[PDB]
């Protein structure tokens, strides 16, 4: 029993535009802040590689359905981008090109028994909103409902399932440094907070947008894809799990708080702590932007479902450290990861696959038990077909889920291996392999090969259980 998926357990594979698409001025489509990332600042990206052409799923899409139909997925979960829809980013042109080419993708989806799974924003947001200054801006909120407008006009008729924003979390630190994620702000403590609050906002209305609009007619669900390491205290003192605490709601309380629970708004400790360290530096007004009561009750409720991306755990422990002002040090945590941990070729990624059932109880206790879809899991390296530490980082998590689901009760709902293939993993360039299909990125032709890990996985796909011989 622990080792089979529920009957209604949907598993598939993910993947996200700019990482893949290509074609990046192709056909009206305009540009976004990783376009102009990786034009203006090479410098920031290993190799200086860019996702120009990556790997070409704006021309290959049907070679994308392919490999999906030998995996035996159920459901795969891509992204759309915004500028290639709304290339000004405001609504007052919509680009025919885009339209045909996701509804291609999504017929061809559904032709070959396959589930769309749609997240809107997955961190291309056109340059000429970063114009304006980006997420920290809070007229996106109501820009954001428009793009999701014409989404869902376009495409809800056809698609069940739809994410408002992926890793919010990763993307507001876009605005905490000068050399890392688009746009590549300096602004950590200060802007960062703003594009969270932003985020939480245009989540919010595009949630109420589909309530009034299209829910109805179209019968769908909308969640949010939040990611969150695991953080497991250094020692067992009150001390170091009072720190673990933090790191939770530092990282998925920020979003997760105001959406998830009852009472919404920002967990009490992210408030507090803000706001002390704001007055003990002296400013007059937190750093911290505030809801008010209104804005709370606006917020909170608007989910069909949580989506989770789990790759790792950290060791947390009593204490303060990062730079002044920046959400780690507002966190009250010092972050470290154990030496005996397996490694994978991404600095921050090691293998803690009970971390993953810990994570998984954390929420269930924290918001009640939600639907959790899993929209991403996956594990790097450098290259190579016979990827045995991409098997067992997905045959571990997967029985960590597994008993998350039969023992523990938790109501996960489906599961989305990040990624279906190789492709542009932001500022790491094409170094850091994460695909179960191998793409040769020197190959004008973008081939995709099954590495051992896909065939494991449409193993476990086409029989809905762990095969013994990776069970315990
Ligand atoms: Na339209």
């Not at 979960?77 to 291609?104: C, K, M, T």
């Not at 440094?177 to 703003?194: K, R, V």
């Not at 190579?384 to 709902?413: P, Q, S």
């Not at 032709?445 to 259980?465: D, F, G, H, Q």
Request: hydrophobic residues 35%; aromatic residues 14%; negative net charge.
């Amino acid at each position: 029993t622990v080792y089979t998926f529920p009957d209604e357990f949907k598993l598939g594979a993910a993947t996200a535009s700019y990482q893949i698409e290509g074609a990046w001025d192709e056909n009206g489509k305009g540009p976004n802040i990783w376009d102009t990332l990786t034009h203006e600042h090479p410098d920031y990206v290993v190799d200086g590689a860019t996702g120009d052409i990556a790997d070409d799923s704006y021309h290959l899409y049907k070679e994308d359905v392919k490999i999906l139909k030998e995996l035996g997925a159920q459901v795969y979960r891509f992204s759309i981008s915004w500028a290639r829809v709304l290339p000004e980013g405001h609504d007052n042109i919509v680009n025919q090109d885009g339209i045909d080419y996701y509804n291609n993708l999504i017929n061809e989806l559904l032709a070959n028994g396959i589930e769309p799974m749609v997240t809107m924003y997955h961190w291309d947001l056109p340059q000429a909103l970063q114009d304006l200054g980006g997420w920290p801006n809070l007229v996106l909120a109501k820009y954001s409902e428009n793009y999701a407008r014409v989404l869902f006009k376009n495409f809800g008729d056809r698609v069940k399932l739809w994410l408002t924003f992926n890793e919010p979390l990763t993307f507001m630190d876009g605005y905490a440094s000068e050399i890392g994620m688009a746009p590549s702000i300096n602004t950590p403590g200060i802007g960062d907070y703003l594009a969270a609050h932003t985020v939480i906002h245009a989540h919010a209305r595009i949630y109420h947008l589909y309530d009034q609009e299209f829910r109805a007619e179209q019968g769908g669900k909308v969640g949010i894809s939040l990611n969150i390491n695991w953080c497991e205290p250094a020692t067992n003192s009150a001390e170091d799990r009072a720190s673990c605490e933090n790191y939770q709601q530092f990282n998925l309380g920020l979003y997760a708080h105001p959406i998830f629970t009852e009472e919404g708004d920002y967990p009490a400790v992210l408030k507090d702590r803000v706001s002390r360290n704001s007055a003990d530096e002296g400013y007059t007004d937190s750093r911290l932007p505030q809801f008010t009561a209104e804005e709370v009750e606006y917020i909170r409720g608007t989910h069909d479902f949580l989506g989770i991306n789990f790759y790792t755990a950290l060791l947390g422990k009593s204490g303060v450290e990062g730079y002044e002002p920046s959400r780690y040090r507002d966190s009250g945590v010092i972050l470290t990861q154990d030496a005996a941990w397996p490694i994978s070729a991404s600095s921050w990624l090691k293998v803690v696959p009970w971390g993953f059932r810990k994570e998984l109880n954390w929420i269930k206790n924290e918001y009640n038990n939600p639907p959790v879809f899993i929209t991403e899991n996956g594990f790097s390296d450098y290259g190579g077909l016979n990827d045995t530490g991409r098997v067992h980082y997905y045959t571990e998590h997967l029985k960590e889920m597994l008993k998350a689901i039969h023992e523990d009760g938790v109501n996960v709902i489906g599961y989305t291996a990040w990624s279906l293939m190789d492709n542009f993993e932001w500022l790491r360039g094409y170094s850091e392999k994460f695909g179960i299909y191998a793409v040769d990125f020197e190959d004008p032709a973008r081939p995709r090969i099954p590495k051992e890990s896909a065939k494991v996985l449409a193993e476990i796909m086409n029989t809905r259980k762990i095969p013994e011989r990776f069970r315990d």
